[PDB]
Amino acid sequence: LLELDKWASLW
Amino acid sequence: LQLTQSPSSLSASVGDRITITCRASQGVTSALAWYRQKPGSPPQLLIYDASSLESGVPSRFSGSGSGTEFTLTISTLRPEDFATYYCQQLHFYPHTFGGGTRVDVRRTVAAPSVFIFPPSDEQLKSGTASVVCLLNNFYPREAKVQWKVDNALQSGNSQESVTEQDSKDSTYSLSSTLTLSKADYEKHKVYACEVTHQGLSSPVTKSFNRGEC
Amino acid sequence: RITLKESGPPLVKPTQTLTLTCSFSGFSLSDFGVGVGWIRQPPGKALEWLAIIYSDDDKRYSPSLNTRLTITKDTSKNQVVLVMTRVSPVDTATYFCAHRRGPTTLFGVPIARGPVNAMDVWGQGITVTISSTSTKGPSVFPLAPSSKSTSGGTAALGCLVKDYFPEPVTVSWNSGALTSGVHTFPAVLQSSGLYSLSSVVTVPSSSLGTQTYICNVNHKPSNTKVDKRVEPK
């Protein structure tokens, strides 16, 4: 389970 | 996750259109960049967000893909484009790079000339031995070299070195060096390196019998 | 506009701690979302990502290297620092710092992700070598022309330059008279912690009896110069 990048959840 | 880049190496000439691709173990949306690295230089950004041209980057570069398959494309190869190319993913930590794709000048396939050099007596006196195998002026860059001593395959006691592609004849050269203690060297008779390359019909063996005069 | 420069020690000993600094201009680390990262390239190898720090002091490290890596920043000084504990010879590389853009913001709110997905600008790189060894001059041995080294009308001869530290070593043939057909290979760092290289040239075998070939080796680091005459087996 890789950590998502800082902005992975930004449009 | 891992980033797999294809091909590892490709040959091209000026004005060529080439295409490098990158596959990811998992979906990384569009968080994919491409870099060009000239020898001795730091990488330089070409494409970000998978398809966006970096301000200041020649229009000949272009990128495409989302999810897991990505492709960089140069439409008209220029001289300064003979370089190595990398992709990076920035969707997950850690930000993985690909393995690289070397892009060299294309030329006529040329089989390596193969030479072997026994250790010198000078060196032997010192107490070590080094047997050198030269592969000279070949193309393309892919070469496999094996060492056999009395038919025993030598694994992990030799080191290879390769020149940069020659600016005139556009070939490579490769050295392989087997290193043994004097003692070990003296227990054996037959020293052989075997060479496999695209321009050889069959693998070439170059050998000598130790202490033969 | 944006410039980054790495600074640090060229040589570090094993088990020691390596501290590297990025000094930048053209951006500020108080810019929103801006990051600074570190990447390394081992000699002859691909790039490896090491760490990143953001303007909010958010930081992330490579999992394989996490334990040994610390990243810190000083916004006022325009500097970022990477610390690596417990170095070992694996860690010999060229180390780069790079800038990562923050998101598109309109009036202070982020509206687009896209610019973030690259490291835009990189520093020139700083090369660090981890060795325990001490300055030493090379031994030069002849690679001598022979039947085993003759193909058609052409022969190969060369010098093997063995066991020296540090880089680099410069090699010439015949006092500079012979340049054509010469290949000097890049050095390999051996298990010793000591470098080795070889220089070879290909020549007419007609000339072997007649002509004399000498290799000139200079290792400025240890003030060692050698002239080695190479002749047939």
Q: Which CATH number do you get for residue B39?
A: 2.60.40.10
Across the B/C interface, how many CB contacts are shorter than 8 Å? Answer: 141
Residue C210: phi, psi to the nearest 5? -65, -45
Q: Tokens standing for C102?
A: 């923050």
Interchain pair B31, A4: CB under 8 A: no
Cβ within 8 Å, pair B136-C202: yes
Asked if residue B63 and residue B133 are part of one domain, the reply reads no
Residues B90 and B128 in one domain: no
The topology (CATH level 3) of C1-132 is Immunoglobulin-like (2.60.40)
- Sketch the domain layout of chain C as residue ranges: 1-132, 133-233
Q: How far off is chain B from C15, nearest CA to CA, in Å?
A: 25
Nearest-neighbour CA in chain B from C52: distance (Å) = 9
CA angle, residues B37, B41, B43, in degrees to nearest 5: 40
Residue from C211, C148, C180 nearest B134 by CA: C148
Q: Are B32 and B96 in contact (CB under 8 A)?
A: no
CA angle C183, B109, B201 (to 5 degrees): 105
Output the six-digit token pair for C36.
């600074």
| C53 vs C22: CA distance, rounded Å | 12
Cβ contacts below 8 Å, chain A against chain B, sum to 18
Q: With CB atoms and an 8 Å threshold, state whether C186 touches B161.
A: yes
Could you tell me where the DSSP H helices lie in B28-142?
A: 121-126
3-state secondary structure of C191: coil
Domain final residue pick, B88, B106, B124: B106
Best of B48, B93, B96 to disrupt the A interface (most A CBs within 10 Å) is B93
* Among C48, C115, C202, beta carbon nearest to B48: C115
Same domain, B162 and B90: no
- On whether both B190 and B167 belong to a single domain, the answer is yes
CA C124 to chain centre: 12
Domain end marker among B87, B106, B125: B106
Cα→Cα distances C148→B110, B173, B197, C190, C200, Å: 20, 18, 19, 26, 15
Q: CA–CA distance from C61 to each of C23, C39, C102 (Å)?
A: 20, 11, 19
For strands B204-209 and C48-54, give the pairing.
unpaired
Minimal-distance CA residue of chain C relative to B38: C124
Q: Collect all residues with Cβ–Cβ distance below 8 Å to B184 and sequence separation of at least 6.
A: B129
Q: Compute the distance between CA of residue B114 and CA of residue B135 in angstroms, rounded to an integer.
A: 5
Give the burial string for C197-208 (b: 16+ CB within 10 Å, else e): bbbbbbbebeeb
How many whole angstroms separate alpha carbon B155 and alpha carbon C222? 34
Rg for chain B, CA atoms, rounded = 22
Q: Which residues of C touch B130 (CB under 8 A)?
A: 141, 160, 162
Nearest CA in chain A to C116: A7
- Is the preceding omega at residue B140 within 30 degrees of 0, hence cis? yes
Indicate whether B52 and B151 sit together in one domain: no
Residue B175 near residue B132 (C-beta atoms within 8 A): yes
B156 CB within 8 Å of a chain C CB: no
Q: Is residue C37 a contact partner of residue C119, using CB atoms and an 8 Å limit?
A: yes
Task: Tell me: do B99 and B1 sit in the same domain.
Answer: yes
My answer on whether B80 and B113 are in the same domain is no
**DSSP bridge partners of C131:** none
Same domain, B135 and B202: yes
Name the helix (H) or strand (E) containing C40: strand C35-41
Report how many helices (DSSP H) and strands (DSSP E) chain A contains, helices first: 0, 1
Beta-carbon contacts of B46 under 8 Å, excluding residues fewer than 6 positions away, are: B33, B34, B35, B36, B53, B54, B57, B61, B63, B72
3-class SS of residue C176: helix
**Pick among 2.60.90.10, 1.10.3720.10, 3.40.228.10, 2.60.40.10: CATH of C133-233:** 2.60.40.10
End position of a domain, from candidates B49, B81, B106: B106
Paired residues of C171 in beta bridges: C217
* 8-state DSSP, C181: T
Question: What's the rounded Cα separation, in Å, for the pair C13 and C94?
Answer: 16
Domain count of the fold of chain B? 2
Q: Are B166 and B206 in a shared domain?
A: yes
For tokens 């993985």, the residue is B96
* Final resolution, Å: 2.6
DSSP string across C27-85 = --TTSTT-EEEEEEE-TTS--EEEEEEETTS-EEE-TTTGGGEEEEEETTTTEEEEEE-
Backbone φ, ψ for residue C131 (5° rounding): -140, 150
C-beta of residue B170 within 8 angstroms of C-beta of residue C192: no
Q: How far is CA C134 from the centre of its chain?
A: 18
A1 contacts on B by Cβ (under 8 Å): none
What separation in angstroms does the CA of C16 have from each of C11, C70, C72, C130?
Answer: 11, 14, 19, 9
Instruction: List the domain range (segments joined by +) for residue B11.
Output: 1-106
In this structure, what token pair is assigned to residue B184? 């070990």
Same domain, B128 and B100: no
A-chain residues near B92 (CB < 8 A): 2-5, 8
- The gap between the terminal CA atoms of chain C, to the nearest Å, is 61
- State the DSSP H helix or E strand holding residue B44, giving kind and residue range, or none if neither: strand B44-48
Amino acid letter for position C80? V
Determine contact, residues C205/C167, Cβ cutoff 8 Å.
no
Question: How far is CA B120 from each of CA B99, C138, C159, rounded to the nearest angstrom?
Answer: 39, 15, 11
Q: How far apart are CA C182 and CA B207, in angstroms?
A: 23
Q: How many CA atoms lie less than 13 Å away from B204 in the CB half-sphere? A: 18
Residue B90 with chain A: CB contacts under 8 Å: 5
Name the experiment that determined this structure: X-ray
Q: Tell me, what amino acid is at C92?
A: T
What is the bridge-based pairing of β-strands B9-12 and B101-105?
A: parallel
Please indicate whether the domains covering C1-132 and C133-233 agree at the CATH topology level. yes
3-state helix, strand and coil shares in percent for chain B, rounded to the nearest 5: 5, 50, 45
Report d(CA B202, CA B143) in Å as an integer. Answer: 13
Whole-number Å distance between alpha carbons of B86 and B21: 10
Interface check for A1 against chain B (CB to CB < 8 A): the answer is: no
B134 contacts C154 by C-beta, under 8 angstroms: no
Checking phi first, is residue B142 left (phi over 0); if not, alpha (psi -120 to 50) or beta? beta
The residue behind tokens 């690679």 is C143
Contact call for B91 and A3, based on CB within 8 A: no
